Structure 1
Amino acid sequence: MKNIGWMLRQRATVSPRLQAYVEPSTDVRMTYAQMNALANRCADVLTALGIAKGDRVALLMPNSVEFCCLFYGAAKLGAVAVPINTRLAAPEVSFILSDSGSKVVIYGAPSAPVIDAIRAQADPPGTVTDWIGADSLAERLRSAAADEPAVECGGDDNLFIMYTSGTTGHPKGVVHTHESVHSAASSWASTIDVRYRDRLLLPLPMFHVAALTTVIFSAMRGVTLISMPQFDATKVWSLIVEERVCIGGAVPAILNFMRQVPEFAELDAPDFRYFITGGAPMPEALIKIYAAKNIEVVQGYALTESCGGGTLLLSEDALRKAGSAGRATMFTDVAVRGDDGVIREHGEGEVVIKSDILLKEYWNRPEATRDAFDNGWFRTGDIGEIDDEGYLYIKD
């Protein structure tokens, strides 16, 4: 049985003195050994707040080491973290908290007004027994034990509930387990050219599935995570050069912008190797420009339902296969469901995925869960085409 929490501990056993989290803007540079110790302290605090195996703990906060150590500590307890977008209004949060039945909510100073609001009136989520702010978490951590929790859990046990649906009805909670997450981390770690002691920049919100699995596989491979809590495209390059960043994540929007800045002119970052792109496929031009700086780019297609895992278009095909979402990667297969209910590895129809990175179920959405699956394959809801050479092209 795999356990995301225990993996953090083994990483601290293998590379105790390796840098695990570096956040310049807040002067926080921690080691794996230390991050694990902080994770243990989070576990102790969580158990003290009545959190037990299966219970949900909501996280509404800025990217930080405490965010990470909180879900890691939750992982070691067999608890379930529910990371929330810090940009949505109080009524959407309340809904998520109520839907997930979160017992405890931990929030950062900048979202205190959303909590104080949900706290003040209406029909407040009745399951929440404790609302812990930044200073309070600080205090509790100070008197928390740092020993390893002893809880037999992992494998198929729930670990994360990530909400998504943007249309109407209501948001849907994607439940992920220790295994699906472990599997997603592994897929990225074995697919891309990522190596021990690499320094990877994480500019994306920790509540996004992509950022979560990045943190996880950073720990799996022994990568020093480089953070920028408040993304500032005017300072990115400096951070990248100062902390010797080898790998970075970004949306084609950002990248295109990042090469406008005067800094870009001729920056010297011999350590930076490539950007990992999500969302919309990179255009020829945008790729050629980065290629001129010996910086390559790889792009992928993934959903929250796929734990941020999926297809990947390797750098070498960046131009030859312009707008393609890539091909299968380690441990993840892709196919297309024909309008006749038949699943083919070539042709067109609805993109489907078969991989241990897939969610277990949508949180309390029986009907939704049944339709998403078709004999082991998950239905993405995206139409696409997989050509001869096996390259995927999304349509709508």
Structure 2
Amino acid sequence: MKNIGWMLRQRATVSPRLQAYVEPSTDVRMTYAQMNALANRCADVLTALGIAKGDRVALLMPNSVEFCCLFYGAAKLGAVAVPINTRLAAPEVSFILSDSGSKVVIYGAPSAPVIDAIRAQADPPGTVTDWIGADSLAERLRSAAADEPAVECGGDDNLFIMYTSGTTGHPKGVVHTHESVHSAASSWASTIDVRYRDRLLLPLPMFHVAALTTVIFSAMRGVTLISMPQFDATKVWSLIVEERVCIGGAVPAILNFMRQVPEFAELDAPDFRYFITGGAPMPEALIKIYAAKNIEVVQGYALTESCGGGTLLLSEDALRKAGSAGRATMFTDVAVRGDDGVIREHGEGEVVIKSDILLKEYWNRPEATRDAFDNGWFRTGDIGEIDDEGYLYIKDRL
């Protein structure tokens, strides 16, 4: 069986001295050997905190090496990580904590006021036994052992619970296993043009499924993650050039706001090849602007339930199929479910997905889980059309 945590170790075996995590703003630089060593300390810390295989560990903190190492460490233990959106208010964070039955919460200094509010409320999440802030994590990690854990786990064992974007009415925990995450990161590494030793810019919050899949897929391919904790458009370009970024993740808005700053006018980053985007189509204009600087753009379509995987639109078809979500990526099949309940490869209907990247279930939501599955196919709830060329077009929501 595959184990996301073991994979980090294996990467540290293959490329021990390869730069794995680069964070300028904080001057935090680490090789894969060091990152894997930090995860082991993280695993030791969690164990002493009473975390056992299956147990949930909440992570409320800014992007950081600690975040990645904590879930990687959790992965080696068979524990389940619950990364939480840091823009969330106390009552919502509290909801996620009790719904997930998290027993340990690791939080950053910026989230202290949120953790304090929850702890002062009437009826705080009963399952939480420890609230570990930045200071305590530092203290604990310092006396932590760096030994490699020895726990047979992985495969279909839970690894993460990602709660569906804020609200739409039904906030649910999306549970992914080592296999579904492995398959997703595998899908990405096999679909987009990623290369060993490439340097990739991650400006997205690490609680986001796409971002999570990015740090994991980076370890799998042996990519140097370039971290920009809090996106800042006044520094993003110099980071791209000074750190010799080859690939960058972003949303259409960011890119449109980025080709505006002064630094853009005469940008000269030889190493930078393309941006990956999703969540909204890319305006033919915004594309051409970037095509100008010889910068390519790949656009994808995915959900939390698909672990950030799904369809993708290669640059070459950006204008030819502008307004399209692309085609199915490696290791994943996409089609449409009619009103007759019949699934077809072409035509309009509800976009359905069949791949190993799919969630195991909705955390403690039996009915929702069974209603999202139809003979192996996951119903996205999105209406769309697939043309004879096999390109997907996202319409309204079912």
TM tier relative to shorter chain: over 0.9
Counterpart CA distance in 2 for 1:69 and 1:194 is: 22
Q: Deviations over 1:269-319 (max 9, x none)?
A: 000000000111101111111111111000000000000001000111011
Counterpart CA distance in 1 for 2:12 and 2:212 is: 19
Change (3 A) 1:167 1:230: closer
Counterpart CA distance in 2 for 1:285 and 1:204 is: 24
Note the C-alpha offset of 1:167.
4.2
Counterpart CA distance in 2 for 1:145 and 1:340 is: 58
Q: Deviations over 1:169-213 (max 9, x none)?
A: 441000000000000000000001100000000000000000000
Change (3 A) 1:165 1:258: closer
Q: Which residue is 1:113 aligned to? A: 113
Note the C-alpha offset of 1:137.
0.1
Q: Deviations over 1:67-115 (max 9, x none)?
A: 0000000000000000000101100000100000001000000000000
Counterpart CA distance in 2 for 1:115 and 1:152 is: 33
Counterpart CA distance in 1 for 2:230 and 2:286 is: 25
TM-score (norm 1): 0.99
Note the C-alpha offset of 1:168.
5.0
The answer to which of 57-66 and 257-266 deviates more is 257-266
Per the alignment, in what secondary structure is the counterpart of residue 226 of structure 1? Answer: strand
Note the C-alpha offset of 1:383.
0.2
Per the alignment, in what secondary structure is the counterpart of residue 328 of structure 2? Answer: coil
Change (3 A) 1:285 1:165: closer
Note the C-alpha offset of 1:258.
0.5
Per the alignment, in what secondary structure is the counterpart of residue 327 of structure 2? Answer: coil
Matched, 1:4 2:4: yes
Note the C-alpha offset of 1:384.
0.2
Counterpart CA distance in 2 for 1:69 and 1:29 is: 13
Per the alignment, in what secondary structure is the counterpart of residue 131 of structure 1? Answer: strand
Ranges in structure 1 where 5+ consecutive residues have no aligned partner: none
Counterpart CA distance in 1 for 2:166 and 2:118 is: 21
Q: Which residue is 1:375 aligned to? A: 375
Change (3 A) 1:329 1:136: same
Change (3 A) 1:168 1:346: closer
Counterpart CA distance in 2 for 1:165 and 1:82 is: 13
Q: Which residue is 2:278 aligned to? A: 278
Counterpart CA distance in 2 for 1:318 and 1:394 is: 15
Note the C-alpha offset of 1:230.
1.3
Per the alignment, in what secondary structure is the counterpart of residue 291 of structure 1? Answer: helix
What is the aligned-residue identity percentage?
100
Over the aligned positions, Cα root-mean-square deviation in angstroms equals: 0.7
Q: Deviations over 1:201-254 (max 9, x none)?
A: 000000000000000000000000000111101110010001000000111101
Counterpart CA distance in 1 for 2:302 and 2:220 is: 20
Note the C-alpha offset of 1:165.
5.2
Note the C-alpha offset of 1:121.
1.9
The answer to which of 186-195 and 159-168 deviates more is 159-168
Counterpart CA distance in 1 for 2:178 and 2:137 is: 25
Change (3 A) 1:168 1:324: closer
Counterpart CA distance in 2 for 1:390 and 1:33 is: 43
Counterpart CA distance in 2 for 1:176 and 1:281 is: 27
Counterpart CA distance in 1 for 2:230 and 2:256 is: 19
Note the C-alpha offset of 1:54.
0.0
Structure 1 runs (4+) deviating above 2 angstroms are 165-170
TM-score (norm 2): 0.99
